[PDB]
Amino acid sequence: YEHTATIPNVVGFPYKAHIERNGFSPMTLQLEVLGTSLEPTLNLEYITCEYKTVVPSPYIKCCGTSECRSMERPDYQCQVYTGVYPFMWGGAYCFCDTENTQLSEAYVDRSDVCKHDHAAAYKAHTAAMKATIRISYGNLNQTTTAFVNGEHTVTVGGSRFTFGPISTAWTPFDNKIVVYKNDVYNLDFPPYGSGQPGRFGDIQSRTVESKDLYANTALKLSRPSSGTVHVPYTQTPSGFKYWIKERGTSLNDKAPFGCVIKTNPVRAENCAVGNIPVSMDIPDSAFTRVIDAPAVTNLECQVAVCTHSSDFGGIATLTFKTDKPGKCAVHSHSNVATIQEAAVDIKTDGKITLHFSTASASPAFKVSVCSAKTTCMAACEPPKDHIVPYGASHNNQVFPDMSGTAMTWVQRVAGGFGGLTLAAVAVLILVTCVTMR
Amino acid sequence: YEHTATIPNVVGFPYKAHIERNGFSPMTLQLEVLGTSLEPTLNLEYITCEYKTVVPSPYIKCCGTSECRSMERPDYQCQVYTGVYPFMWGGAYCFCDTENTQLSEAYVDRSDVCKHDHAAAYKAHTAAMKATIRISYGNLNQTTTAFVNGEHTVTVGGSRFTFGPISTAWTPFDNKIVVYKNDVYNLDFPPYGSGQPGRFGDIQSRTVESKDLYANTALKLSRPSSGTVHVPYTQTPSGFKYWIKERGTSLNDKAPFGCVIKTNPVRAENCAVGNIPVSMDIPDSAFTRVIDAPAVTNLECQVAVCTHSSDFGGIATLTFKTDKPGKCAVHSHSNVATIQEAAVDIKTDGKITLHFSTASASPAFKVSVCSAKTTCMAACEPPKDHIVPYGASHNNQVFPDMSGTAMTWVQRVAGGFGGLTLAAVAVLILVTCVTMR
Ligand SMILES: *[C@@H]1O[C@H](CO)[C@@H](O)[C@H](O)[C@H]1NC(C)=O
Ligand SMILES: *[C@@H]1O[C@H](CO)[C@@H](O)[C@H](O)[C@H]1NC(C)=O
């Protein structure tokens, strides 16, 4: 038996779902949302990490003839210097002054821990979210995991469940992002095509396959000083190191809905955005018929205290003439007030205590027993005063009953102020009709 | 030196891109596009393969006590029968009748060549596309490889190029597709949750690691006949084999632009749609300056025969006084007619032959030498009666020129017929100005 329902996509909030298929005993469904996850799609444009400037020893040859060459590995600077007069601890070496040559070369290479100390970039696409849902009812209580996509199936037991599409995807991720050892950032990194020499992405190599190490580190050489042998070069500092030293504002504390983020598959957890639909079908042999426990007759309530707004403050009592005892279900039709207990046993006395909670100062809830329903209002006067850390057990809406028992005088005085004008204008219409003649 | 251009996405079509910066001789670029390849995103919902019905040998026991047990393997048919009188080669076993047990059980499992003979489902989304581009200019002719995404460099050499994003992604794929041994289909599938018993995907297993082989193949058991030992089970044939048998209508023949599909990463190649923008920058020292071979003087063009529309029938003669002979650049400003010759050598005589092509019978292409420009017109009346097997090499725009030579009489007769009524309006105006008085 199919049936549609909607649940606010919030973790740790029990949800009620009563069934009203006549010919059988009415019953209810307990729904629990536990640890939803949202796993985006990744693209892995390029990766970056540290780098070392690899330079070999300089060459000195005592003839003075020039030797120039180039090789295809990236970022070489084929510079040759003459007129060098090098020294060394043996006073000096060779003898031909003003006739000498030095060919100093250098390049860059990725870090020795490029497989471990690397930061990666990624693209963001439309994401899919999983969920773990705990379903319970009469003599059944178990959990399951579903894709909560546009269509899926649970097969939790004799019954079956389906989850509808998500109303809106207010995902924290956007466009392109960066990840670095268990944290992410919404950095607008430069493209693979070009790189600013020093800010970020100094090397723009792809995966560790180790080919085509693009780099814009921009080495610059100079003529060595007359003192002794050197390899003078100017190298901008590692932008990746600077990005480490700055970092700041890790995205984990920037989640709009407090959506904590793990990184091993890159996903998001436990944030309450929108609401989710559900459609269920139930075998008819999953619960007893109407022949068991008809215990309604006349039904009346009594309201005691409504110390509300924290967990449950609406303590109420229900009394009624009862037949032989049995399992009977109860719920509340209005969404203003929510009760906390499912079907409960009934003794022969007829007095049963129930709890609920609501922010409304004058609740007008609609109690329904497994065969009869009645209205019952409470002067929910106690306004609490705390700052509690536990969750709420009510809808965010609040509005006093139009009928009510406190704001009645305001609406009646407004109605009287309007009715005096209405009666007077009726008198005016009658008098003008008489005088028109 | 940044400059922008557009290229139609037609494979095998040389493209001429002219740069006419002052202070240097104008220069021309040859553009080639070789085998584009659009690659989509894949999601891998689940898998589908054959199913084997595994049935153990039946259990016999001559005491009458039944042993019904339930396990966690899929789609058990737990049933045991009584009143069985089995027979074998030795006639029969045991003696008791009307008090016997016959236990029969069966279940389903994935196929043996599941590792190789599987079929894959995938979800498509926004897709990137790579292109191979060959660039040529003066004494430089090399291929490239760019992702032609929103922004990315090429760096073919002294110059640098960046290919812009595609206008619209008219991907042949859509939503959900199926991959099975070198062919795809635009055929939707039931979700991973539930499936129809027999049509397709009656086995909806996840990844090949053989976990939770969900089955809805509807096994049924029956009472064995009184003759001998049996195990009567009824089962619908495998939907995977039936789907292979019917197959038909491969997607490789439904490409809306003749885009051949290769399955190893699943991409679509060699198909024309839209156009590709590009930007570039060129070093100053990549060409010559104006002081080299200025020899335009005056100019005029002639045409001998202009049988057009197939490859190139527009032989044109250009003569002009010449200075010291040398190289130069030549192209056409408009696109009504297109040429094939790149920068060409110039002799002292000045007689130069050109090959061009067009569609309309009255081209108005304006030729342009690297310093001069003169209007060229021709009466390319004669078509040719063939159905060519090779590619077209000109823009599809067919339109007689505003000036023209055959449609002029239409223009003059329309102008004259307008002139009759214009002069009639004039004479009416003079008459009414006389009579207004
Ligand atoms: C359902 O079972 C869980 C343990 O798996 C338990 O904590 C919970 O209280 C049960 N629900 C009810 C309504 O008893
Ligand atoms: C570029 O070089 C290839 C040889 O690999 C040649 O076939 C082609 O014609 C050259 N391009 C031009 C415009 O001549």
Coordinates of N, CA, C and O in Angstrom, one line a residue, chain A residues 93-155:
Chain A
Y93 N 94.3 27.4 -9.6 CA 94.6 26.3 -10.5 C 94.7 26.8 -11.9 O 94.2 27.9 -12.2
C94 N 95.4 26.1 -12.7 CA 95.9 26.4 -14.1 C 96.6 27.7 -14.0 O 96.9 28.3 -13.0
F95 N 97.0 28.2 -15.2 CA 97.8 29.5 -15.3 C 97.3 30.5 -16.3 O 97.6 31.7 -16.2
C96 N 96.5 30.1 -17.3 CA 96.1 31.0 -18.4 C 95.1 32.0 -17.9 O 93.9 31.6 -17.7
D97 N 95.5 33.2 -17.6 CA 94.6 34.3 -17.2 C 93.9 34.9 -18.4 O 94.4 34.9 -19.5
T98 N 92.7 35.4 -18.1 CA 91.9 36.1 -19.1 C 91.5 35.2 -20.3 O 90.8 35.7 -21.2
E99 N 91.8 33.9 -20.2 CA 91.5 32.9 -21.2 C 90.9 31.7 -20.5 O 91.6 30.7 -20.2
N100 N 89.6 31.8 -20.2 CA 89.0 30.7 -19.5 C 87.5 30.8 -19.8 O 87.0 31.8 -20.3
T101 N 86.8 29.7 -19.5 CA 85.3 29.6 -19.7 C 84.6 28.8 -18.6 O 85.2 27.9 -18.0
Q102 N 83.4 29.3 -18.3 CA 82.6 28.6 -17.3 C 81.2 28.4 -17.9 O 80.6 29.4 -18.3
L103 N 80.6 27.2 -17.8 CA 79.3 26.9 -18.3 C 78.5 26.4 -17.1 O 78.6 25.2 -16.8
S104 N 77.7 27.2 -16.5 CA 76.9 26.8 -15.3 C 75.4 26.7 -15.8 O 74.9 27.6 -16.4
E105 N 74.9 25.5 -15.4 CA 73.5 25.2 -15.8 C 72.7 24.7 -14.6 O 73.3 24.2 -13.6
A106 N 71.4 24.9 -14.7 CA 70.5 24.5 -13.6 C 69.1 24.2 -14.1 O 68.8 24.7 -15.2
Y107 N 68.3 23.5 -13.3 CA 66.9 23.3 -13.6 C 66.2 23.0 -12.3 O 66.7 23.3 -11.2
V108 N 64.9 22.6 -12.4 CA 64.1 22.3 -11.3 C 63.6 20.9 -11.4 O 63.5 20.3 -12.4
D109 N 63.3 20.3 -10.2 CA 62.7 19.0 -10.1 C 61.7 18.9 -9.0 O 61.8 19.7 -8.0
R110 N 60.8 18.0 -9.1 CA 59.8 17.9 -8.0 C 60.4 17.4 -6.7 O 61.5 16.8 -6.8
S111 N 59.7 17.5 -5.6 CA 60.2 17.2 -4.3 C 60.3 15.7 -4.1 O 59.7 14.9 -4.8
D112 N 61.2 15.3 -3.2 CA 61.4 13.9 -2.9 C 60.2 13.2 -2.2 O 60.2 12.0 -2.2
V113 N 59.3 14.0 -1.7 CA 58.1 13.5 -1.1 C 56.9 14.0 -1.8 O 55.8 14.2 -1.3
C114 N 57.0 14.2 -3.2 CA 55.9 14.6 -4.0 C 54.8 13.6 -3.9 O 53.6 14.0 -4.2
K115 N 55.0 12.3 -3.6 CA 54.0 11.4 -3.4 C 53.3 11.5 -2.0 O 52.3 10.8 -1.8
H116 N 53.8 12.3 -1.1 CA 53.2 12.4 0.2 C 52.9 13.8 0.6 O 51.9 14.0 1.3
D117 N 53.6 14.8 0.2 CA 53.4 16.2 0.6 C 52.8 17.0 -0.5 O 53.2 18.2 -0.7
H118 N 51.9 16.5 -1.2 CA 51.3 17.1 -2.4 C 49.9 17.7 -2.1 O 49.2 17.0 -1.3
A119 N 49.6 18.8 -2.7 CA 48.2 19.4 -2.6 C 47.6 19.3 -4.0 O 48.2 19.6 -5.0
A120 N 46.3 18.9 -4.0 CA 45.6 18.6 -5.2 C 44.5 19.6 -5.5 O 43.9 20.1 -4.6
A121 N 44.2 19.8 -6.8 CA 43.1 20.6 -7.2 C 42.0 19.7 -7.8 O 42.3 18.6 -8.2
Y122 N 40.8 20.2 -7.9 CA 39.7 19.4 -8.3 C 38.6 20.4 -8.9 O 38.5 21.6 -8.5
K123 N 37.7 19.8 -9.7 CA 36.5 20.5 -10.2 C 35.3 19.9 -9.5 O 35.3 18.7 -9.1
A124 N 34.3 20.7 -9.4 CA 33.0 20.3 -8.8 C 31.9 20.2 -9.8 O 31.7 21.1 -10.7
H125 N 31.1 19.1 -9.7 CA 30.0 18.9 -10.6 C 28.8 18.6 -9.7 O 28.8 18.6 -8.5
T126 N 27.6 18.4 -10.3 CA 26.4 18.0 -9.6 C 26.7 16.8 -8.8 O 27.2 15.8 -9.3
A127 N 26.3 16.8 -7.5 CA 26.7 15.7 -6.6 C 25.5 14.8 -6.3 O 24.4 15.1 -6.6
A128 N 25.9 13.7 -5.7 CA 24.9 12.7 -5.2 C 25.1 12.5 -3.7 O 26.2 12.6 -3.3
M129 N 24.0 12.3 -3.0 CA 24.0 12.2 -1.6 C 23.4 10.9 -1.1 O 22.4 10.4 -1.6
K130 N 24.1 10.2 -0.2 CA 23.6 9.0 0.5 C 23.0 9.3 1.8 O 23.3 10.4 2.4
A131 N 22.3 8.4 2.4 CA 21.7 8.6 3.7 C 21.5 7.2 4.4 O 21.3 6.2 3.7
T132 N 21.6 7.2 5.7 CA 21.3 6.1 6.6 C 20.1 6.4 7.4 O 20.1 7.4 8.1
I133 N 19.1 5.6 7.2 CA 17.7 5.8 7.8 C 17.3 4.7 8.7 O 17.5 3.5 8.2
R134 N 16.8 4.9 9.9 CA 16.4 3.9 10.8 C 14.8 4.0 10.8 O 14.2 5.0 11.1
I135 N 14.2 2.8 10.4 CA 12.8 2.7 10.3 C 12.3 1.7 11.4 O 12.9 0.7 11.6
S136 N 11.2 2.1 12.1 CA 10.6 1.2 13.1 C 9.1 1.3 13.0 O 8.5 2.4 12.6
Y137 N 8.4 0.3 13.4 CA 7.0 0.2 13.7 C 6.7 -1.0 14.5 O 7.7 -1.6 15.1
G138 N 5.5 -1.3 14.7 CA 5.1 -2.5 15.5 C 5.9 -3.7 15.2 O 5.7 -4.3 14.1
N139 N 6.7 -4.1 16.2 CA 7.5 -5.3 16.1 C 8.5 -5.3 14.9 O 8.7 -6.3 14.2
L140 N 9.1 -4.1 14.6 CA 10.1 -4.0 13.7 C 11.0 -2.7 14.0 O 10.4 -1.7 14.2
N141 N 12.3 -2.9 14.0 CA 13.2 -1.8 14.3 C 14.5 -2.1 13.6 O 15.2 -3.0 14.1
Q142 N 14.9 -1.4 12.6 CA 16.2 -1.6 11.9 C 16.5 -0.5 11.0 O 15.7 0.4 10.7
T143 N 17.8 -0.4 10.7 CA 18.4 0.6 9.8 C 18.6 0.2 8.4 O 18.6 -1.0 8.1
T144 N 18.9 1.1 7.6 CA 19.2 0.8 6.2 C 20.0 2.0 5.6 O 20.1 3.1 6.2
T145 N 20.5 1.8 4.4 CA 21.2 2.9 3.6 C 20.7 3.0 2.2 O 20.5 2.0 1.6
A146 N 20.5 4.2 1.8 CA 19.9 4.5 0.5 C 20.6 5.7 -0.2 O 21.2 6.5 0.5
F147 N 20.4 5.8 -1.5 CA 21.0 6.9 -2.3 C 20.1 8.1 -2.3 O 20.5 9.1 -2.9
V148 N 18.9 8.0 -1.7 CA 17.9 9.1 -1.6 C 17.8 9.9 -2.9 O 17.5 11.1 -2.9
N149 N 18.1 9.3 -4.0 CA 18.2 9.9 -5.3 C 16.7 10.1 -5.8 O 15.8 9.9 -5.1
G150 N 16.6 10.4 -7.1 CA 15.3 10.5 -7.7 C 14.5 9.2 -7.7 O 13.2 9.2 -7.7
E151 N 15.1 8.0 -7.6 CA 14.5 6.8 -7.5 C 15.4 5.7 -6.9 O 16.6 5.6 -7.4
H152 N 15.0 4.9 -6.0 CA 15.8 3.9 -5.4 C 14.8 2.9 -4.7 O 13.6 3.1 -4.8
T153 N 15.4 1.9 -4.0 CA 14.6 1.0 -3.2 C 15.4 0.4 -2.1 O 16.6 0.2 -2.2
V154 N 14.7 0.2 -1.0 CA 15.3 -0.2 0.3 C 15.2 -1.7 0.5 O 16.1 -2.4 0.8
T155 N 13.9 -2.2 0.4 CA 13.6 -3.6 0.8 C 14.1 -3.9 2.3 O 14.9 -4.7 2.6

